[PDB]
Amino acid sequence: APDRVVETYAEGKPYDLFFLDVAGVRLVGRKTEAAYPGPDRDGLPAERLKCALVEARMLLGVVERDQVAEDHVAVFHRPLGEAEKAELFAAAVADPTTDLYYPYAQLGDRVREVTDESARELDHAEEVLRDHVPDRLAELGFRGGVAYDAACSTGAFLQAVGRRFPGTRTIGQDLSPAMVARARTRLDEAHCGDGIRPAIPEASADLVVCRHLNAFVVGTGQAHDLLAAAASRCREGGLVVLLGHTPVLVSSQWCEMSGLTPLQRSGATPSGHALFQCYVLRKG
Amino acid sequence: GQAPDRVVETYAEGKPYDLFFLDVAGVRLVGRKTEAAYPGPDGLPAERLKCALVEARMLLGVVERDQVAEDHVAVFHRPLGEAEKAELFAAAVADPTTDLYYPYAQLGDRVREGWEVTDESARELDHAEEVLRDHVPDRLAELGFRGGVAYDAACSTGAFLQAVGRRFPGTRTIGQDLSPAMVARARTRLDEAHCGDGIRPAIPEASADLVVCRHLNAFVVGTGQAHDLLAAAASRCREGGLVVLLGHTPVLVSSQWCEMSGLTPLQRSGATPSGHALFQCYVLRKG
Ligand SMILES: Nc1ncnc2c1ncn2[C@@H]1O[C@H](CS)[C@@H](O)[C@H]1O
Ligand SMILES: Nc1ncnc2c1ncn2[C@@H]1O[C@H](CS)[C@@H](O)[C@H]1O
């Protein structure tokens, strides 16, 4: 018999309901505090953090049907055992094409600050991801060139990419001038301005990074406009990378309709204990 | 293996309630309801009518993912060929357990926007339910229904419950409807007809052999109201009895919620004898 998971709009968090499309089977989970950056060691337990990471223990069951109503979102599912959760979660870790998405990230009222500690906070929450992406870009054929970060933040991420591919020109852009001030110490080039006004000519970058198309940063319409803005900077055959601390607001299906063929959709921690969103797309 | 497509319905002017899902062969298909060939298929062309009927031509593709946004709902899907739709639609016709539902029926503005019922208006409703009247009584016989007390919580003109009372003679037909103009017409068709909100059922608790609900649907009630009314109507059904959910407009209660409430679905959709059309027809056994 099926079960129902609910997130109300007034005080619930619809953006915490994630879907995992594994092996033609859709699973539903509720994101909680994840073990960050790695799993609990033998004698030292890992710290918890609300971040991009999902783990098997946050899975709920096998999605049968949803019902989006006036004041809440409901997902009907058949519950999964703890061992069944881990095995299906492992199959998603073994397949980076697995989509991890949050279909209700723009529902509810909850979705409706640059300091020295605030820059350190987001840099820490993106660590498990700075460790993953540059190596994974090498395995996907990235050879270097011009790397464009449309919302570079401190610039630590794009700098990590430029370290992995020596000779890559790192060009950052951020809306916050406090962000740009820091990013100029880590990047060859950092511009102050909204991503909707890109600072580089079109089709001039071999890698475009988008970390701002996400819940609590932009709305749905804006995220799709900024996606078309950042991707217009990518040359043909180049790579577009979408990820984020908070749920990405664009689907990989929309990217495919935009001519951005997904090469991978999610990534896992080296231990395999967690999954996160990591869309790597090839512009056609 | 097909690059996706997108079907959109806006809340302000679109019709999200017209997007239907077909859960056939362990996969979800998406379609948009248009005017169906009613009551039967076409060498004379049948009349077209917005009703409970969906046809294979109304399918769009295989659901990949949806995105319920602030001002619209989108469904990403791989489009199906016309021959492919009929093949999958025929497999749904051949399995009345196929769930046909409208998961966005309670979203949008159109579903948010008198004393007299004329003779022609009563004719209008009975005609829209004719395919449904021809099907359920014969289908309820094949599912073990032997008779007793048949309670219709929103009997409307009463013609539907009268059809049931004819397939199973000796059954006491109890009607109820919010509208007093409905009750007056249903009194001429049923053993008794009561005026009142189905949230206050006019029939003893846990005493009916069959409960019919045509009011748990879009444009009739809200979502929370539909669930409260379902609880009230099913509460009149005796253990082991049958509860039937159906509607001219999309049914607002999920089959999964019926199973959570002790109502085991024996079938979820029905098909015209021609097999050309499908419609929602939940038959639930109470435990
Ligand atoms: N529309 C936009 N264009 C460029 N950068 C943006 C942005 N919206 C947010 N950001 C930038 O993205 C970073 C992570 S939230 C943050 O440093 C913010 O300044
Ligand atoms: N809350 C309610 N209780 C009983 N009947 C209701 C109702 N809401 C609508 N109805 C009745 O159901 C029928 C739907 S086509 C219609 O004849 C209306 O009078």
UniProtKB/Swiss-Prot annotation, chain A:
<comment type="pathway">
    <text>Antibiotic biosynthesis.</text>
</comment>
<keyword id="KW-0808">Transferase</keyword>
<keyword id="KW-0045">Antibiotic biosynthesis</keyword>
<dbReference type="Pfam" id="PF13649">
    <property type="entry name" value="Methyltransf_25"/>
</dbReference>
<dbReference type="GO" id="GO:0017000">
    <property type="term" value="P:antibiotic biosynthetic process"/>
</dbReference>
<protein>
    <recommendedName>
        <fullName>Isonocardicin synthase</fullName>
        <ecNumber>2.5.1.38</ecNumber>
    </recommendedName>
</protein>
<dbReference type="InterPro" id="IPR041698">
    <property type="entry name" value="Methyltransf_25"/>
</dbReference>
<dbReference type="GO" id="GO:0016740">
    <property type="term" value="F:transferase activity"/>
</dbReference>
<comment type="subunit">
    <text>Monomer.</text>
</comment>
<comment type="function">
    <text>Involved in the biosynthesis of the beta-lactam antibiotic nocardicin A. In the presence of S-adenosyl-L-methionine (AdoMet), catalyzes the transfer of a 3-amino-3-carboxypropyl group from AdoMet to nocardicin G, forming isonocardicin C. Can also catalyze the transformation of nocardicin E and F to isonocardicin A and B, respectively, but in vivo substrate is probably nocardicin G.</text>
</comment>
<dbReference type="InterPro" id="IPR029063">
    <property type="entry name" value="SAM-dependent_MTases_sf"/>
</dbReference>
